[PDB]
Each structure stands twice: as structure tokens, then as C-alpha cells.
């Protein structure tokens, strides 16, 4: 890696010259460099622990031990970054001296004093200095970022390894949870990282302050000292204010997150919601919640207003009160223009320190908190790194207090089938997990030679977020026949058909979390597939289904078939393999009788069984409102148009002081002129604050109404998370941190134009050099927008699977400890951790390369503006604007490009306008061939199917073919359709929610074509086969409607046997329906929906195929509700198990992908005959 290029990043050239042609992948990203490989960085830091193992006063480690480690860990390279930061800031001060030396020499008409003569000389010295000044600051930024990158994994590995020695009794799910270590990755690493991003500056920024003060003092003196203290002492007002901003952010998330959870609630069961036709109330609850969310973001704006304001006003507010003190209150010194310009030059320089200092103080304190949160975590209880026998042990599920099981001996040699049974809890999975060694074995011995002289599945499912076949893999090689000898041997093929892509589907997170009869079944699959010797399966009949338990007996018969002298030692509860078992159970509350033979046992007990241009107009010009957007224009214009003009006065009035109406009268004019922008800047801060507040209020209102009427076929076709990705991230983008980018950029780019416009007006042949120059400025930017985008979205796709690895590492901790797969997963830890760090490198690479290449360009401006500006002799005050803006180009094009880059990312959120607005269909009501129709009630259950020819999506295949059917009042049609072509296709279709390609549907006599679907589909009962539990209040779960009752609400739900089962409600008839059906049953969950079906008062309850019913007695109570509570209408008995066809009134077995036969009466035909089959 070559050194002057290691200065200015020349290796990035061919990278980005690559990047204009091809898009960029992780393959286009590289290997890690030798030191940047994370395990090396981990390696040195463990040595730093061993170094302070020599100290060992109280070595938990602890925080005092940590920072003594970390300083001697990374500090040498940190010193090098600090040294460049110092020397650069020192030459940061030298430029102002150069300005002073020019104008002082140019008020006029070998020795070093003579060598200090010429503005030729001093300007060239200025240029050649300001190369280094504008270079070593981008060394010192760089190396410090290439320090925190080397922090990241070298912390994260220590974290992850302590997870590899973590113990799990109550602490692992109590005080600290998966989230509580997850944010500890997600925050406290970055708290450390941004600390070491800023760690030089806390050493150094006050030295920049004090030497800025002293090099102001040798310009004015006591007027310097009285002027400086505003800008010095007023920066911790930012430390006051941003504290309130953090307080507002705490107010933000605490009010946003539950709302977003309720948005996910409204979105997940959106099909049932529009099936309930309940978009209005469900959206209205989020709408009035949003009113308070806006009221919180109101203060978020009021906080973020003055941050900008005091960041911008206090420069001028210092500079004027500095000068009026030098003019009025003191009046001693003559005021040269050289003074007056370079005074402002330092004033421009010193702020870019000063309003980072609060963020420094914040981050330093936050990280010093976070190291304690790291430490007091990190010194918690380890997991005691130290045939299947147990020789008389004393095990404890607890840590070293009260034991759980003593005197426990067991033995399981090879070639053996053994379960363990008893009472749950005491062996919920307990004694098997005690065999794992995941308990405080206070005494006794145990033998596998597993550690020193292994498969498992947990009683809770801990799957992985991957492909389903990859979840079946669980760090395995491939054998697709053996996989067919597993997956088909598990019979997950129906669940694989329920998956959209089967073996290539999306298991874990972002997928339908099915039952353990799928999920834990897939775990038992990866268990059996694992090609291990000994297995420990856990009570899978509790997770299985009934016929799945029959297949689980068959899977046990495939297990022992697959047990080619294996040692699978399961445990269960049922009496199924109580006949078929090699050895026996032992659990009463501890060691029950042994595994040998139930002959001499108590078996009687067991025998009981480019850019985005128009999108900104879609942001603003469609939604801003014109008058405030015009104020956003004009206030931005007229602020800077008087700001640089205040500097234009600030030269020439002192040029008259260099000469000699009244200049003291000129000064108070200038004073109030400086006060004018000080007045304006408040309205400038209030503009974008109020603007983005109004923008996001209507934008979120619009997207709410946009999704509020969309058809359900879309939502089945839409991946629901891709919608909520527009609601979670993009909304918070548009609210919390969209417009500050704009307010920065509108402050930025005008000043970028403006300083050029000044130096143009100074020298009329400036622009002749600018025109080749700004070419280069543009073409570097034009390449740059490609790269910084592709890095930034790369970043976005990178640390997310990194912490996803953590979450699975938390949850499936036990099972990887069982497989002893830490070596695999520490490797695959790195395999992400690397790709984070190398992406972060190339991000922070072009983060440097851009501005340093643009910075030399800015320096070229300086010299050219100087050399042109020599001819003002051939006036002299008007030089001083040139010099003061020549040096002030840099922070401008620093931000003026980078923010324009990040605006493109900020626009990528509001790209989802088209995902919202353009996607719009399905006017629900409003067709309405009558305006007057009280047959939304109907007392006549004679529906009709007037040769209705429906298509599914009007895309691939029809559902019917001219079905000229009808219905009779009381004719409860037992629905019998195709096993894979027409099952659900006649209920939501009967709610007109599909592409009925021909044929009408007469309802209460009249066709349902032009009728209010909001009125029709809400006054029609349908108890579908999805668990519909709207979280909230109990009356809100029961009756969130207009004519809500409590007597009838307590009547039919007692007829549903829920208002008497939950008669001990916490709030009674207005109780809280907490968690959306996590405390109530799975059966009364639907019985409350049956009471809602009573509440519609048109009880033609179109039920669905309730294939997941736990109690068949509860389904018989539902049959009693079909008997007693269904008031003799056309119950469309959709049945995946045709057992419920036993109560047929007038069925229509319309099947084989078609309309087979009207099944009434006595139709025990080839489906009802094969209903037993």
C-alpha cells in the first residue's frame, strides 16, 4: 500500500472508475486486509486482558480494568490520529495569519522580514500550507475511523464468546433478554465506536479553542477577550438543547413503537379486517394515536429549531457584539481591514469545532454508561467450562443457592430407546436439560466423553431464519436423497406446500410461524438428519397434531429404522410408545424408579391411559402547500443575500477606517444590518421545522387512506413486511430526519454559490478559471453519487443479518451448545462481521476520497482568487472577502456534496409514494344501484348464484364455470369443493372480493353488483378459520361499532361460553383485551367472533375450514351454536375435515375443480363416502 497514495486514497480511483460501469457487489468488495481480519484484532485484545491479569487487583474484569486494557490496546494508532489532528488544526490557524499579512502588506504604496514581504510569497505559502491543513485533517479523520472499525468485531467477538459461555437459568430471560443483549450490540458497540471516532477531539478541541482565543488576542486584545466568550461559552447551550432532543427521542419511540405494532396488527389481519369491513375504526384508533405522535414530534421540531438557530446566529451575534465592543464600549485601536477580515476568518473557523463539542460530551458520557452496561453484563455467570451415565449427582436448575435435583443416577448405553415421563414442569424439559449439563451439578459424575471421558432438540422450538431446507440443514452438508429420506420422512411436504417456495422458502423470521407440528417437526427433522450418534428429543406429541402424532409414531418407527445402532434417548408424556420402549422413564419430582422393566414397578399409575427528480415535487409540490414553500424559498434566499452582504460592508467600512458620512455612524448601521440576519435566522429555522411537520402530517395521512381501500388480492400478493418497511423506516425517515438534511442543504449550497459570486464580483476574470474548475468539481461529484449510494445501500443490507445472527445465537443457544457448534458459528460470526467492517471501510473510504479531492479543488480556488486579487492594488478591503471565502469554501463543499448524496438516500424512502399512491384500486361502496335498501338486514336466507362465472385474479384460471346456483333460508349448505382448486374461492368471492368475470350474485333478491360493500360485507356474518383477535379493550375486541351493547354482548358470549368463562374479567364488559388473544383460549377466540357474528343480526354465518381446532368438543359446541345460536340460515359449511358435514341441511357438493353436484338430501356419495377415507 503506497505512501503518498496512502495520503490521498489513489487506490480508490480505479475502484470508483470501476463503479461507474458496473454495479457493486460483495464480490466487488474485497478480502479483508491482514490486520483488518477481526480475529487478529480479537487476539490482541485478549492479550490485553492477559496483560492486566498481571495486575489482578479485582479482575472481573470491570470497567477500570477495561479502560486500562483498551488504552494499551489501541492507543498507539489513536495517538497517531491525534498527532495529525493537532498539527492540522495548528495550520488551521495559520491561514488567518496569511489573510492578515496580505492586507496589511497591501495597504502600502536577504531578510526573513523581507521573506515575509510579498503577497506573492505569503499567498503561495498559504496555498502550500493549506494543502497540508486540508490533507492531514483527512488523515486524522481517517485513521480514527480505521480504529473504530477495528474495535467493532474485536468487541463483538468477546461478546459472542461470552454467549458461548453463557448460563441460562433466570437471568437469561429475566433481567437481560434477547433484545437486551441485541441493542447492546446495536447501540453500545456504536457508542464505543463513535467514542473512538471522537476521542482525539476531546484531547484537542479545547486546544483549538484556546489557541483560537490567543490568536484572536494578538489581533484585538481586550476586545478579543470580550468578544470571544460568546462563541466560547455558548456552545454548551447545544448540550442543553440536544438533551431535550434526546428526551424527545425517548418520547418518540415510546409513543411510536406501540402505534407501529398496532399498524402491524392492522396490516397482518387486514384480510380479516376488510372481511369484517372494519377498516374505519381500526384506522381511526391509529389516527387519533397519530395525533399525539404528531404532538410529540411537534416538540421534536421545537427542539431541532434552536439547534440550527444557535449554530448559525451566534456566529454573527458574536461578531457584531465583538465589534461594537471594539467600537463603542472600548474605542482604542484603529481597525484595519486585515483585522476585520481575519477576525471573521477565525470566527468562521472556530464554530465547526464548537458545535460538535456538545455531541462529544454526550457521546463520551453515553459510552461511559455503556461500558458499564457492557461490563456488569460481561462479568456475569459463566457456564462452567469443564454410554450416557450419571453417577449420583446433585443438579440445580438454579445457580449456587437451592438445589433442584440431588442423588440422581442414570445410565444409557448405546443402542437404546428411552423416554422419560411424569408430571410437567419437573421435567417440562428439565431432567433432559440436566443431562446437557445446563444446570448447577453440585455433585456426582456423568459420562459421555462428549466433553472429555451430540444432538438434541428443545421442548421450545428454536428454528432459524433461513431457507426451510437450510433450517433442516442446521450446519450440515448436503445429501438430497437423505434429505428426501428426512423431509418426506418427516412428512413436512404439506407444510412445504403451505410454504410459497418449500425448500427454497423463508423459514424463521419473515414467514408464517406454524405449530411445532411443523416448526418443532422441522427441528426433529434437522435432529434426525444431523447424522449424529445420540439424540435427545423432547415430548413432540405436545407440539404435534393427532394424525401427526400417528405420523410421529411412524417417525419413531423411521427413527429406530434410521437408528443404525444409534442412541436416541427421547422423552415424552403420551402412552403411545409406552408399549414400544427399550428402557423406561424416571420422573416423579426427581429420581423415580429406574429404566429397566415395568414388571416390578408401579405401572398401575401409568396404566390410567440517477437522481430522483420528480419525487421532490411529489414530496413538496404535490404536498407542501404553496405559501410556506415560498417562504422556504424566500427566507433561504434573503438570509444569505444579506449575510455575505454584511461581510461586504465589513470590508469597506474598515477600508474607510484604513483611510481614517461618519464611520462611527456607519458602524451602528452595520450593527443593525448584522442584527437583520440575526432576526431572519429564527424564521429560517422555523421554516423547515414547520414545513416538514406539515409535510409528514399529510403524507402519513395520505398513506393511511391509500392502504385503507386497497383490494385483498393485492395483500395476498404483497409481502406484508414490504408494506410495513414503508411504514416503519420510511415514515421515521420522513418525520425525524428528512428535513434537517434539507435545512442543512439549503443553508449549504447557497453559500457555495454565494462565495463564488463574491469572488466573481471581486475579480471579473475569476470565472475564466472557475469554468474548467467547476467541471472537475462536477465530474467528481457525478462519479461520486454512484458510489456513495451503492456503499450506503450495501451498508443497509449488511449489519442487519449481523445482528440476526445474534438473535438466533441467543434463542437457539442450547442447541448449538449441544452440537458443540461454536467453532462453526464463531466462523460464521466472522463471515458477517468481516463484511460489515469491509463495507464500513469502503464507505468511510469514499467518505474521505471525495472531499479530499474536492478539497484540493477548493484550495486551487484560493490561490487563483489570490493571484487575481493582487491587482486590486493595480479595493484592498474588497480583497478581504476574497480571502475570507477562499478559505471558507471547504466546509461548504464538504457538506454541499455529501448532503446531496444523502438526500438521494432520504429520497429513497419517499420513493414509496408510488408504492402507496399509484397502487390504488377497489372503490368499496359508491356503486349503489339503490340508494334506499333496508335489505342489508335480510330475514330471507335465499341467496342466489345467477350463473356467476368467477376468475381468481382474472389472470390464470377460473374458479367456476357458469354456476347457476341458489340458496334457501335455512339451507345450511355443507360446502364440498376441490382439495386444491376451489375451497376458499366461494366465500370472499361471495363477499365480492374477487374477479367475478361474469354472472351476478343475487342477495336478498337483488344482485350484489352495484351495492355498498362497506354496508353489505359488514352486515353479514362470517366466522372464518383464522384466529381473529384484535388487541385492545375487551369491548373494543367485542363491539368496536356504532350500536355497541353490553347486555347482548354478555348474552351471546355466555351462549358462546366465554362471557361466563371470562366472567372474572379485570374490567368486565369494558376490560382490556391484552396481547390480541395470548391469554384467552384458541377456541373462545373464535367463540367471541361468533358473538360478533350474533351482533351483525344477519346470522348467515359463512364459516370456513377450521382445520386447527384444539378441542373437538369445542367444535361440537360450535355445532351446538350451529344448532341453537345459528337461527336457521344458509350456513356455508366450508370443511377441510368433512366431519362437520354431518349436520347438512341442503348441501351442494360442488367439487373436482367445478360444480359437481347439489348434495341434498341423503348425499352420502363419493366424497362423504370417502370422508371416512
Author numbering: 222 to 330, 346 to 622, 678 to 744, 770 to 925, 994 to 1044, 1059 to 1272, 1277 to 1575
Task: Give sentences copied directly from the paper behind this entry.
Uniquely, the sulfonylurea receptors SUR1 and SUR2 lack transport activity per se but instead are devoted to forming the ATP-sensitive potassium (KATP) channels, wherein four SUR.x subunits form a complex with four subunits of an inwardly rectifying potassium channel, Kir6.1 or Kir6.2. KATP channels are gated by intracellular ATP and ADP, key features which enable them to regulate membrane excitability according to the energetic state of the cell. In pancreatic β-cells, KATP channels composed of SUR1 and Kir6.2 couple glucose metabolism to insulin secretion. The SUR1 protein has an N-terminal transmembrane domain referred to as TMD0 that interacts directly with the Kir6.2 subunit, followed by a cytoplasmic loop termed L0, and then the ABC core structure comprising two transmembrane domains TMD1 and TMD2 and two nucleotide binding domains NBD1 and NBD2.
Recently, we found that carbamazepine (CBZ), an anticonvulsant structurally not related to SUs and glinides, also corrects KATP channel trafficking defects and surprisingly is effective only for mutations in TMD0 of SUR1. Here, in both the RPG/ATP and CBZ/ATP structures, we observe strong and distinctly shaped cryo-EM densities within the same GBC binding pocket. CBZ is a smaller molecule with molecular weight about half of that of GBC and RPG. However, in the CBZ-bound SUR1 structure the cryoEM density corresponding to the ligand has a size and shape that markedly resembles GBC, with one end pointing towards S1238. While the close proximity to S1238 is in agreement with our previous finding that mutation of S1238 to Y diminishes the ability of CBZ to both inhibit and chaperone the channel, the density is too large to be fitted by a single CBZ molecule. Thus, an intriguing possibility is that CBZ may bind as a dimer to occupy the entire binding pocket. Alternatively, the result could be explained by a CBZ molecule having multiple occupancies, and what is observed in the reconstruction is an average of the ensemble. Due to this uncertainly we did not model the CBZ molecule in the structure. To our knowledge this is the first protein structure determined in complex with CBZ.
